[PDB]
Ligand binder design. Structure first.
Ligand code: MN
Ligand code: NA
Ligand code: NA
Length: 327
DNA sequence: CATTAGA
DNA sequence: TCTAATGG
């Protein structure tokens, strides 16, 4: 957690770089297990050798470890940090839509800069166009203050369209968080569950409405189950206009809301931990259900969920407010 | 790990 | 169809 910091750290610096700038999935995969292990190790690694003893630890990484233990640096790392080409891929990637592959290819052609990206808006598809368009607003965090207004609005139209709609803005905002990155609404409806062969419209209707009023300004991707866009709060009695925000809405078969709802709320740890517990408590939990465990090794039979509680009660736990789902 | 764009 | 990018 701290004893092996610089280590796992440089480790990751490395691994990442393989996978992005290079297409060394493996080496990339290597630095990670390694960084994964050394991370767990209970003692101050003093040298390569010591390290080396580890599973995942080979001669290469080990080798690096020394150089870094000896000198508070690494050349390879020092070179890569410098390398513009590689600096470039690191940056382009930040565009919503730009992946590595693409990051590289642009570079290839010579698109390195943000402006470059501009003079060639043509080479870009919608996603990346909008991504590049809202580059600024996309990097900024979402003040809860705003988080509250947004949530407000979404709630209303949803109810406005059909009253039967159930919606929950999940994630960190849900867990109290003073700020958020994008907003995630989980949607559902009674008329839609596990069996009942869809109602794509279900998702559609809402999207349309949010648009109607001018909440959703653009569509990044919309399918019959997961919309993915941009929104903005009505810029008041002017002088201050809102930033373009990322938003995602997903339809959910009512007989799997809470689990999913549980889930997306996290935290990442709380989840796992809760997850680890239901296991002992004779269960299994996943983004959609919770099946009582059977001794033959495994078992199925999805339990009946009506609220965050049911799941709790299931594994026999203390209902935890979202506020305290911290871990 | 699963859902959408695209080519 | 596969392959990329997002999320989570
Ligand atoms: Mn979020
Ligand atoms: Na070894
Ligand atoms: Na990106």
């Amino acid at each position: 957690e701290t004893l092996n910091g610089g280590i796992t750290d440089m480790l990751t610096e490395l691994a990442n770089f393989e996978k992005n700038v290079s297409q060394a999935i493996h080496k990339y995969n290597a630095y990670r297990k390694a960084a994964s292990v050394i991370a767990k190790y209970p003692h101050k690694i003093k040298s390569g050798a010591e390290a080396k003893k580890l599973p995942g630890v080979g001669t290469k990484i080990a080798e690096k470890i020394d150089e870094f233990l000896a000198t508070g640096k690494l050349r390879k790392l020092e070179k890569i940090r410098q390398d513009d080409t590689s600096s470039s891929i690191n940056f382009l990637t930040r565009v919503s839509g730009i992946g590595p592959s693409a990051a590289r290819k642009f570079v290839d052609e010579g698109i390195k800069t943000l402006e470059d990206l501009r003079k060639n808006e043509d080479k870009l598809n919608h996603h990346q166009r909008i991504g590049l368009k809202y580059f600024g607003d996309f990097e900024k965090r979402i003040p809860r203050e705003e988080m509250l207004q947004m949530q407000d609005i979404v709630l209303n139209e949803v109810k406005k369209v059909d009253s039967e709609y159930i919606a929950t803005v999940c994630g960190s905002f849900r867990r109290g968080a003073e700020s958020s990155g994008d907003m995630d609404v989980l949607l559902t409806h009674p008329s839609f569950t596990s069996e009942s062969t869809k109602q794509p419209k279900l998702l559609h209707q809402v999207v349309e409405q949010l648009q109607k009023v001018h909440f959703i300004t653009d569509t990044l991707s919309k399918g019959e189950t997961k919309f993915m866009g941009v929104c903005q709060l009505p810029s008041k009695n002017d002088e201050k206009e809102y930033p373009h925000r990322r938003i995602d809405i997903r339809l959910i078969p009512k007989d799997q809301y809470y689990c999913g709802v549980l889930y997306f709320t996290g935290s990442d740890i709380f989840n796992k931990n809760m997850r680890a517990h239901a296991l002992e408590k004779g269960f299994t939990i996943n983004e959609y259900t919770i099946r009582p465990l059977g001794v033959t090794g495994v078992a199925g039979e999805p339990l009946p969920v009506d609220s965050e509680k049911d799941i709790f009660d299931y594994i026999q736990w203390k209902y935890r407010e979202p506020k305290d789902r911290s871990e």
